[PDB]
Amino acid sequence: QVQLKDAQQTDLTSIQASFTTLDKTEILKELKVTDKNQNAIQISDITLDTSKSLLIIKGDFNPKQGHFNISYNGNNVTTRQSWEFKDQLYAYSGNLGAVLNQDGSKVEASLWSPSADSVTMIIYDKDNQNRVVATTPLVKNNKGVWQTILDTKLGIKNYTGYYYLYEIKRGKDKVKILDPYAKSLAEWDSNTVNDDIKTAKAAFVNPSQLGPQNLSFAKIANFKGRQDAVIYEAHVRDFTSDQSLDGKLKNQLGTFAAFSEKLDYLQKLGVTHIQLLPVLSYFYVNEMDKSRSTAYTSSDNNYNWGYDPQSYFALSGMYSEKPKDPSARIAELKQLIHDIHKRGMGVILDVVYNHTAKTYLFEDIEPNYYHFMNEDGSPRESFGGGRLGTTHAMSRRVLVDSIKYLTSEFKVDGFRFDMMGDHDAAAIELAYKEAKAINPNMIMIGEGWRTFQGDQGKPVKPADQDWMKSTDTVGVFSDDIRNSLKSGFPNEGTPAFITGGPQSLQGIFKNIKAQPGNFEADSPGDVVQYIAAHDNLTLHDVIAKSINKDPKVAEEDIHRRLRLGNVMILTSQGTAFIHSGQEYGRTKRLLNPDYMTKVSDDKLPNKATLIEAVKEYPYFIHDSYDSSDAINHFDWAAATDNNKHPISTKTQAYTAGLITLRRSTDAFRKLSKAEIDREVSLITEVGQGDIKEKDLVIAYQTIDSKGDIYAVFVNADSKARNVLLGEKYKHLLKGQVIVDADQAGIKPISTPRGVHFEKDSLLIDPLTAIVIKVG
Template sequence: MKTAQQWKACYLEPAFQAQYTYQGKDLGAACSGKGTSFLLWSPFADKITLNLYRDGGEGEPFLQQPMAREEKGVWAFRTEKNLHGIYYDYEIRIDGETKRTADPYAKACGINGRRSMAVDLSLTNPIGWEEDHAPEQPAERIIYEVHVKEFSWDPAGGFPSEYRGKYKAFLCEDTTLNAEGKHPTGIPYLKELGVTHIQLMPVFDYGSVDEAGDPADFNWGYDPVNYNVPEGSYATDAARGEVRIREMKEMIQSLHKNGFRVIMDVVYNHTYSLDSWLQRTVPWYYYRLHEDGSVSNGSACGNDIASERPMCASYLFNSVLYWAEEYHIDGFRFDLMGLLDTDLMNRIRTALDLRFGRGEKLVYGEPWAAGKTAMDPGFTQALKANFGKLPPDIGMFCDNTRDVIKGAALKPEEPGFINGRPGLEEEILDSVSAWCGGKAIPVKAPSQILNYVSAHDNQTLYDKLASTLEKGADIRKACRLAAGIYMTCQGSLFFLSGEEFARTKNGLDNTYDAPVSLNRLDWTKSLQERGLVEYYKGLIALRKQLPGLCDKSPNAVQRISGRWNKPGAVGFFVDNRAEGRSCRWETLCIVYNSKSTPERLTLPRGTWELLADGESSFLWKSPVRADANIAAAPGSILILGKTAADEKNCPADLFSGR
């Protein structure tokens, strides 16, 4: 039998690539009224048998059908019968060894993904699916990260018991807090909050939760099994392959109807197990190996997908297009995008633009890896340092902004600007202009930057501040300052569900398999922390009215002027005008004060209105004229807007005491 190194050497031969790179998009099971086809790419198989089953879990096959070898390493079986709802797997003999495998190209599956299912996708569409479409592009991208089970698990959320933790919870449009009937939860709450995009944590079929087990079993889902199949534990019936498809489509349809665009968290950098369907069909083709034959583990999850190899690249590329076309997904968040290659990312971006219109689908990801990876020679990782090789319409989570605001995510005890670490003022100001023009990150435009201070991994914002602020400090006040900073930086905005009501995970920073009782959204806190929620709502609503901050163009940095800083405080002006659009405030003045004392300033001539401060983010609704001499309160943000254009530029020595 060949060693892993021998397999790798074979795949890197130009002759192999020329002989076995299949260009078709029809791999997998295609099922319609015209018949059913099964196509599998396995170039070194000696024999493949297709097994057909009535059941997706147990039982023997009712038919075992030898498959025929065709060109480019593809094996096929075709029939005029519509086999919708029939389950299948393959027996493959390679290099003298026979293995049973599900279909890596499957679009439906049975319980726990062990058997694939032939599906006529037209029969899975909910009523009105053909008319489903995303809402219009919003004035700003405000992305809210949600886990399907976390969203509706809390009984206090008012969701029907049979929908708790399920896709169908997103169809409920009248949920309220059980303890307070007038307080919205779920979809009504998100509409009031004002977010524009819902980023769903993994909803493809993953391996760490038993779909036939305890409904309370929990995992984040970053362990792919079937890349093109929805996760079954979120469906009301995981045993029927078509149900999970229909219910996921219903969820997306509901989110669209309620004004949200939908982003899918995709994990194309590794699989749940090295013994995957990919590995069983083409040994060692889809995985990276070091020179000594050891498995590359830049994901820290046991393996790295070889995105640079032609058939692997096509597999991932077609998967993205499939979710966008079949499920109407509006954007993709790439987990550990730094493990993928820039060629693939550029190819995906170009294809989405050609198919749906430039920028219609969002593409962004984590521009890092968990460790070194053994990428084949001649390719470049999509790391932060290599972002110059990606177009402006591929974005990244900006850990620079995150860490300078609140402290390093990987160092729980390290503070940032808002919790007392000195010397970060210039970096805070670089965050304001999305790091454009600086040397820290090769950024082309604010469109490449996602500003955030919390996500599903690492500590929640509340927990980070609780562990770094002095005892007795006002944590919620610091939360308001953190939100005020990243929501007034150029770039797109992102935050973890529940950040706005002081979500806590008791200080734990990696709760991927912790009980759902810890991970679930505690809807009672959305009422208990109503003041903080209102502060977020006001910032979000204000942000949508500020074109100077919403500008994603390469020239947006030119809107920022009059930057200044002193220990613990910074300030700047923003040109808030927009061509062809009347703006209530032509110039903004923004101050971040992390000190324990006020920061006083003298405003230039003109009519200035107070839009937000550390206590209220809704001052702009009934603006009060600001005094020429004003102060940013301790540990607070101050946002002012000038209502009439000034003949002269704002003076560089505007602020007192300098």
């Protein structure tokens, strides 16, 4: 029953051969090894691993005479190079990609592909991307890097704006690939994909020549660390796709250039960093269709969040006014970023190295290497594409080089990693080190969910929530504070602190101190505090679902609860995170006539959540990645029109004032856990007055470096509550109210609403937040 299955070369003198089973003399009989020309190779020794049913074969296996044929009883298999051995032989540290000279007369090009028989560049007309104008063969060096220099010989005087693909030949097969180090691309429409050309085309550009030449990193006032960041998460389309802006907007809707026209709002709002959803090239899109999708739908829209990665260096053409000009988008993003920096803010880019849109994107270039792999060599896959194996040297280069390019070229102030837990901690550490070396004020965050897969049977320390106890570099989202305050996975819509579900106050209090219960944070900067984001139901919609009330009659109550949530996030230690629209009560309700009322299970709308109490239009979208502009647009009237929308504008002014408070004092922005435990204390301890172990009211006190004292009270109960102060906190009765039921800020409120001062206690109205300051 002993039969040879496969084999891999792992170093210069070693080959591992896998068998069906191994249950030494009798096998060094039958086993024979030959080179690429069928010539016999001497076996120095063998070792049997009966547990793994693999045979380790020793000898002199020169890879230049490879690959080797291993044979046993009629089975003949060809050796595959392991990724570790491919790194040993081919790991390259030189320049990759295509570089134009100053006047555009010459391009120096480089592509890494060590297993290729030949590599040919195909060049396409800048003014007609389907028109082939030239082809030229590249030459391979010792590290498997194919190179050429484009010049007058191809009949082209200036290569600027021209497009290119690489045709790689390995034996009988030929395939056309996209330069992974491409700095721009031809206008892209995924409908044009066929069997021959199935990627966008790279473009010849000179990034350094484009955009404002004095582009610099952010200058954020009183920003001394990741704990001082107040991050605002926006999608470039969403932020300016409102029909309300038609006739306002000097630039085209949903572009970098339009986004800049609304930065004053964000400057006033008070956020420090603007986080943009994926601006790098994504696959499922038609960039030549900028039309607004006006019907309320949750599927089959040109709209895309951008989590279908095509390139890690080249920007998407979707947010460019001139997608057919590959230089424009580089200039347009630089200008937006310069406009952000001018207003005292920073920019953070959402980046998606965990997976690609299509496994072939990298697998066509070099097989059995770039992706995390199964033991048979096949690529591990995720979300319809390939899992980038960032423990592998050239895959790690792609991540780190793109982070360095984006940082230094676009002067980016931070990065957010999608599914950071898919990655090894070493790659993200290195990315941080390199980024921080360029930009000393660099900050990084990411989704640290425990999702790691990696290479089969090759465990590695992942960059997830458990990494936080062994690093003070990248911070992770706190799902614990999210869930405890307003629900989330696996139980979205379940009553929680601000939605009528009593929670353990110690757990809430520890979250407020940046000490979540589901992972160890040894520093407050490890924790990104949030209750909403682009994913899942909006804060408004999840509140309405959780309490089961129709916004048509309960708009006011929903916003009272929403404001409590924003108070808690903006007075909690760590890094504060706000979803775009969280400030006004953004909604994703499906206002489609076909879903005026509850429909059958068979005809359910995609990615929608039913709120039973709603009479007309009961479905709300919890995953709007493929939803229309009608669903996804930022509602500017709701955000800024005081007369037409008094409730949402009151909520946004409330949120703006909470941001001012937060930035006004380091009481809410402490550096260490040590000082947090010593200087942030729980007023509502279990047994003080009517406070129970699980409850809906909480109060806490913090002190700043000037020792100024700030006390925050949140009554999330539906009845009034007396909060006991006693001899310990009686000094608070002499303080000034700076946040009440109606307004938030840093100035004393002369006649505060929702609170009454007693002898040694405070009487607080239902669904009311109070903040007192003692100078």
